[PDB]
């Protein structure tokens, strides 16, 4: 087991007991997790990396940088 998660970095909620459900994202770059939701990923959007075979890379706001 990893025992791992990571947390949003814009507020993740608080701890998030529940990353099971929390729909969070895996960047690409640092693997971080950021909120599917709080971070204004559309699930449309959100379905389209989901669907595809990997060949994208979900960047996290630092990553991303621009803000
Ligand atoms: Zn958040
Ligand atoms: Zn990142």
Redesign the pocket.
């Known amino acids: 087991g990893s025992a791992k998660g990571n947390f949003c970095p814009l507020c993740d909620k608080c701890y998030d007991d529940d990353d099971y459900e929390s729909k969070m994202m895996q ?6 997790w950021v909120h599917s939701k709080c971070e204004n990923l559309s699930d449309e959007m959100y379905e389209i990396l989901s669907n595809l075979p990997e060949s994208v890379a979900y ?2 706001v ?2 991303t940088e621009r803000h």
């Open positions: 960047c690409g770059k640092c693997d971080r960047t996290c630092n990553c």
